[PDB]
Paper text:
The assembly of tau into amyloid filaments is a hallmark of Alzheimer's disease (AD) and other tauopathies. Cryo‐EM revealed the existence of disease‐specific tau folds, which are challenging to replicate in vitro. We studied three full‐length recombinant 0N3R tau forms (the wild‐type and the C322A and C322S variants) using an RT‐QuIC assay with brain homogenate seeding.
Numbering used by the authors:
A (entry chain A), B (entry chain B), C (entry chain C): 316 to 434
Write the structure that this text describes.
Amino acid sequence: SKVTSKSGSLGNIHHKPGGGQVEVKSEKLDFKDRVQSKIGSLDNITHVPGGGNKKIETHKLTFRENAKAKTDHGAEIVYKSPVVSGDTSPRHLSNVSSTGSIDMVDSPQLATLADEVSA
Amino acid sequence: SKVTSKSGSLGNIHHKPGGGQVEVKSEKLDFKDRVQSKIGSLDNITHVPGGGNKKIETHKLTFRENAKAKTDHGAEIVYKSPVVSGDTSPRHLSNVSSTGSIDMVDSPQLATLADEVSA
Amino acid sequence: SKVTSKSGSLGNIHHKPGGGQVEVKSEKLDFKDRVQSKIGSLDNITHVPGGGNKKIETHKLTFRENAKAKTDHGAEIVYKSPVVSGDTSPRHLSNVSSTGSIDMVDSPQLATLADEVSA
């Protein structure tokens, strides 16, 4: 008589890793600068989410100019100045489960900048 | 007469590691600068969330100018000054479960800056 | 009368690695600069999501100028300044399960930039 909608079900999990053998012999272990090391170890992620989830993401822009006369004998400059209705240069990194590494980096090597506005 | 909507279910979890063997032999262990090491160890994440979750995000912008005459015999400069209706240069990093490493990094190398405005 | 809709079901998980053998013999282990090492170790991700999830994304831009006369004996400049109705130069990196590495990197090498506006 079951009804299941938008759902996750796993049932039973059995782990029986007893009696495994791991050996590491060295004169030196020398681990430097962001090493990850996993020797005979277990790492385990079980994710059983319910469904029917919603993301709603709305952008609305209304831009209007009213003029009779614009820049009569003048100078009008619009520079690097967009009208967007959304994000400007967004970065998204999405993951759900990780047993390793996730890494978002921004490292410009940028010896000079200069902005001049000289009306 | 069971009804399940937007749900997670995990029945039973069993774990039996008895009699497992791990050995590391060295004259020196030398771990330096952000090292992760797991030796014969368990790292476990179980996530069973309910569903039906809602994320609602909404940006609205109404921009209007009324003018009679604009910049009559003058100079008007709009510089790096957008109308956006959203986020400006956002970073999003998302993960649900991690047994490892997560990084978001800013490291600009930037010897000089100048902004000049000179009407 | 059993009904399943938009749903994930696994069943049962049985794991039995007993009697497995791994050996590493060296004079030196020298791991440097972002190394991931997995010796006799196990990593496991089980993902059983419910379905029927929704992502709704919506951009609306209405741009209008009204004028009778525009730039009468004047200079009008629109520079690198689009009307968009969406994201500008977006980055998306999407994944679900990782036992490895994920990275998003910006590393521009750039000796100069200059911006000039001179009405």
